[PDB]
Amino acid sequence: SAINVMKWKTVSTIFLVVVLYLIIGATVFKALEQPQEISQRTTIVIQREKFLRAHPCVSDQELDELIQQIVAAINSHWDLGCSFFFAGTVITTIGFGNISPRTEGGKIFCIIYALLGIPLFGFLLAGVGDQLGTIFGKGIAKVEDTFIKWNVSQTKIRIISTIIFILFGCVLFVALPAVIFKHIEGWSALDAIYFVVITLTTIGFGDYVAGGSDIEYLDFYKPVVWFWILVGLAYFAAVLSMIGDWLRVIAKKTKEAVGEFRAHAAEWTAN
Amino acid sequence: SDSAINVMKWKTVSTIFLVVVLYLIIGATVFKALEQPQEISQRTTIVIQREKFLRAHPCVSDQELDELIQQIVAAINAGIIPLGASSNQVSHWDLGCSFFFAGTVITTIGFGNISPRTEGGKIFCIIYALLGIPLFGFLLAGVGDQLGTIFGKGIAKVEDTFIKWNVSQTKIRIISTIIFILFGCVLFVALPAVIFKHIEGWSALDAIYFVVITLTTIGFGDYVAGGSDIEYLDFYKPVVWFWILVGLAYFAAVLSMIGDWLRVIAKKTKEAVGEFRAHAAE
Numbered sequence: 247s248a249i250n251v252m253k254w255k256t257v258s259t260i261f262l263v264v265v266l267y268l269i270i271g272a273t274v275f276k277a278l279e280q281p282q283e284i285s286q287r288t289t290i291v292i293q294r295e296k297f298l299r300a301h302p303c304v305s306d307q308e309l310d311e312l313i314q315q316i317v318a319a320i321n322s323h324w325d326l327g328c329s330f331f332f333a334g335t336v337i338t339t340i341g342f343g344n345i346s347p348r349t350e351g352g353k354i355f356c357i358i359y360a361l362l363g364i365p366l367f368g369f370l371l372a373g374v375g376d377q378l379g380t381i382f383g384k385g386i387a388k389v390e391d392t393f394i395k396w397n398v399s400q401t402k403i404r405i406i407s408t409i410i411f412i413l414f415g416c417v418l419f420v421a422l423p424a425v426i427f428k429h430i431e432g433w434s435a436l437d438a439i440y441f442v443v444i445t446l447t448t449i450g451f452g453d454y455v456a457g458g459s460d461i462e463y464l465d466f467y468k469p470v471v472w473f474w475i476l477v478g479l480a481y482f483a484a485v486l487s488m489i490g491d492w493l494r495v496i497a498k499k500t501k502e503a504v505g506e507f508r509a510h511a512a513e514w515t516a517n
Numbered sequence: 518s519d520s521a522i523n524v525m526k527w528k529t530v531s532t533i534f535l536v537v538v539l540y541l542i543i544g545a546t547v548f549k550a551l552e553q554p555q556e557i558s559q560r561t562t563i564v565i566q567r568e569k570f571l572r573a574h575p576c577v578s579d580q581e582l583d584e585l586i587q588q589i590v591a592a593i594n595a596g597i598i599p600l601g602a603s604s605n606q607v608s609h610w611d612l613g614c615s616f617f618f619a620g621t622v623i624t625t626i627g628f629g630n631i632s633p634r635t636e637g638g639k640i641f642c643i644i645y646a647l648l649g650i651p652l653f654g655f656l657l658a659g660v661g662d663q664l665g666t667i668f669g670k671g672i673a674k675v676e677d678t679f680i681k682w683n684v685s686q687t688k689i690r691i692i693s694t695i696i697f698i699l700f701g702c703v704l705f706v707a708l709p710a711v712i713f714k715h716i717e718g719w720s721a722l723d724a725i726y727f728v729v730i731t732l733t734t735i736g737f738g739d740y741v742a743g744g745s746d747i748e749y750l751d752f753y754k755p756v757v758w759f760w761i762l763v764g765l766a767y768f769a770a771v772l773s774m775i776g777d778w779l780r781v782i783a784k785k786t787k788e789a790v791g792e793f794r795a796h797a798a799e
């Protein structure tokens with residue numbers, strides 16, 4: 247019973263931290279998106295009135311009619327390339343959602359496909375992460391013999407190892423594919439980085455999709471991006487895990503800072 | 518970290534890799550078999566609606582028609598409502614909406630119905646994801662632990678009904694797993710589905726579909742609870758928030774045990790291939 251009370255206090259504090267995090271994020275997102283949302287809000291209503299006046303021969307009541315059936319139409323996209331990419335988007339959980347099942351049977355099969363594919367792909371992702379782990383481990387085990395030379399102690403070397411990991415991982419799984427996407431997809435630099443992060447975190451908004459545009463592309467383009475999806479998902483799993491590990495020590499150092507502070511402040515009211 | 522096992526591991530993942538490739542290949546061909554027909558059924562009915570007004574309004578440039586379609590669908594990617602009967606739209610980035618969006622990012626569901634457009638929004642979204650996803654992982658771990666300990670006490674109450682009719686061991690563990698999947702499906706999949714059926718006005722299959730697509734954190738965005746311009750019950754979206762929490766915990770557990778079942782199946786297949794190759798044509 248009492249260990250469950252200690253658990254409830256831990257989970258409660260974590261939950262409230264997450265709520266506060268959402269509150270901060272919400273107010274910040276509003277602060278950035280609303281202003282430029284009006285900048286884009288007037289650009290379409292202007293085109294409305296301006297093309298109703300530039301084409302007076304068109305009925306104003308027939309204007310909204312086309313918008314109805316157009317948004318209804320948003321409600322070939324299904325060649326082997328598209329369905330294969332979609333089968334990738336389900337089992338990786340990267341739910342871009344650009345194309346989705348509309349038939350009832352298609353929805354049922356998508357359910358079964360997800361429930362079986364996500365675990366199997368988890369096994370694959372584990373194997374890839376292990377391969378990368380041993381390949382990077384030999385590199386850090388070779389650079390530790392050239393590091394213990396000019397030095398005295400340790401602990402600093404683990405942090406240098408993590409720094410090397412973050413640097414090479416960022417120049418191989420986020421930077422280089424970003425500049426390639428800049429060129430092939432015609433995206434901007436920040437949009438390329440944005441796409442990399444949103445995809446490799448498995449968030450997958452769908453506002454930026456590599457190989458999804460009406461661009462020529464190469465025979466070895468989308469397959470290479472597939473391979474990048476594999477290794478990048480592994481790398482981002484590791485980096486997210488270790489960011490969580492940093493959060494652990496931060497929580498511990500903050501509760502010990504709180505102890506240090508309350509203990510150094512209680513004796514001041516006494517004096 | 519060395520030795521010969523790294524070859525033995527490479528054979529494992531490689532075979533799994535080919536399996537997943539095969540798994541994708543099959544998955545690709547079947548989806549096409551269902552979605553492609555109704556895609557052309559609507560693809561030719563709209564090009565008719567195009568041409569029928571392409572001839573009924575020759576006063577239109579028609580080359581500027583699809584041009585207008587360009588800017589309208591591009592603005593729909595930002596979620597526009599260009600109407601005159603309802604010449605007053607609501608903001609997609611108020612506190613209520615932006616809170617839900619910040620929820621969709623840290624859970625990785627990422628519905629994507631509304632997305633950042635400003636430069637700062639994208640940069641902040643990157644930082645926000647990189648810090649939020651692990652923290653929410655801790656929260657999900659705590660909720661999964663709470664559900665696990667409540668289920669442990671629940672099965673600890675029925676253990677007096679086990680030490681009686683045929684005393685076994687593992688066969689009772691499988692019943693435990695059965696109880697887990699059944700009750701979890703009737704509380705985190707079935708009940709919210711019928712609620713979505715009622716409030717959101719979705720169909721039964723669409724409700725189950727939404728539940729599954731969200732609790733797996735896929736999140737296509739074609740179905741969003743509380744995402745329509747409907748009144749709702751003010752105490753609806755918070756309840757769906759709590760459902761998001763407990764459902765993600767439950768689905769993590771269910772996916773993990775599906776993987777374990779796949780493991781046992783894979784071992785039984787590696788033994789079946791041996792039995793067959795050794796028995797060669799009986």
Ligand SMILES: CCCCCCCCCCCCC/C=C/[C@@H](O)[C@H](CO)NC(=O)CCCCCCCCCCCCCCC
Nearest residue numbers: 252254255256257258259260262263493496497498500501
């Ligand atoms: C950039 C983000 C920074 C976020 C990090 C700031 C810290 C906030 C997160 C703290 C969450 C608790 C973490 C672990 C808690 C205990 O399991 C831990 C076991 O190892 N025990 C203690 O620390 C020894 C003391 C035990 C503390 C119990 C948990 C805290 C409860 C304190 C308040 C009690 C009321 C709770 C209701 C809100």
Ligand SMILES: *[C@H]1C(=O)N(c2ccc(C(=O)NCc3ccc(Cl)cc3Cl)cc2)C(=O)[C@@H]1C
Nearest residue numbers: 327328331334335456457458468471472475
């Ligand atoms: C139909 C459609 O969906 N695509 C299309 C086809 C192929 C890709 C693709 O493979 N992108 C690289 C890739 C691979 C796997 C994953 Cl999990 C993600 C990604 Cl980004 C993208 C889009 C089309 O060209 C039409 C629109």
Ligand SMILES: *[C@H]1C(=O)N(c2ccc(C(=O)NCc3ccc(Cl)cc3Cl)cc2)C(=O)[C@@H]1C
Nearest residue numbers: 609613614617620621742743744754757758
């Ligand atoms: C603006 C917008 O984004 N929403 C909106 C507001 C709130 C919700 C919501 O909370 N749905 C339940 C929920 C909670 C958390 C998560 Cl991670 C997922 C879900 Cl489904 C949805 C949509 C609006 O009504 C306008 C369009």
Ligand SMILES: CCCCCCCCCCCCCCCC
Nearest residue numbers: 418422423426466467470471474
């Ligand atoms: C041995 C690993 C090297 C890491 C780079 C290999 C490819 C990973 C992504 C780079 C290419 C992705 C963009 C697609 C270019 C055709």
Ligand SMILES: CCCCCCCCCCCCCCCC
Nearest residue numbers: 528529530532533779782783786
């Ligand atoms: C080194 C392990 C290789 C995997 C052995 C074959 C596994 C194939 C059976 C499980 C794969 C998913 C099948 C789902 C329907 C039975």
Ligand SMILES: CCCCCCCCCCCCCCCC
Nearest residue numbers: 536539540543544786787790791
């Ligand atoms: C829905 C996909 C079902 C696919 C079921 C069969 C695919 C995997 C079978 C591979 C069998 C390999 C035997 C391993 C021999 C060592």
Ligand SMILES: CCCCCCCCCC
Nearest residue numbers: 250251253254663666667
């Ligand atoms: C372990 C289940 C929760 C125990 C405490 C219940 C009331 C606390 C929330 C108000």
Ligand SMILES: CCCCCCCCCC
Nearest residue numbers: 327328330331468469472
């Ligand atoms: C997903 C379709 C893109 C074209 C081929 C990409 C790789 C095919 C085999 C992995």
Ligand SMILES: CCCCCCCCCC
Nearest residue numbers: 354357358361362722725
């Ligand atoms: C009518 C809904 C049918 C859902 C079928 C689910 C099958 C799960 C197999 C793992």
Ligand SMILES: CCCCCCCCCC
Nearest residue numbers: 364365368369372773776
């Ligand atoms: C990753 C989600 C599916 C978990 C089952 C796969 C087991 C190996 C991954 C840890």
Ligand SMILES: CCCCCCCCCC
Nearest residue numbers: 259263266267500501504
């Ligand atoms: C981002 C602000 C979080 C503050 C942490 C409060 C918890 C204190 C632990 C004793």
Ligand SMILES: CCCCCCCCCC
Nearest residue numbers: 613616751752753754755
């Ligand atoms: C406050 C929790 C729900 C967040 C969605 C915003 C709408 C609040 C009233 C339903």
Ligand SMILES: CCCCCCCCCC
Nearest residue numbers: 278635636637638640641
């Ligand atoms: C406001 C645009 C200037 C460049 C982005 C600055 C904001 C970064 C997140 C606070």
Ligand SMILES: CCCCCCCCCC
Nearest residue numbers: 435436439640643644647
């Ligand atoms: C080009 C700007 C890239 C955004 C900076 C990302 C920093 C991540 C810190 C967590």
Ligand SMILES: CCCCCCCCCC
Nearest residue numbers: 702703706707721725729
């Ligand atoms: C994943 C569990 C799905 C529950 C089956 C739904 C059956 C509804 C019949 C009324």
Ligand SMILES: CCCCCCCCCC
Nearest residue numbers: 339447448486625733734
């Ligand atoms: C819902 C479980 C599917 C596997 C993804 C888990 C998190 C992925 C990015 C952290």
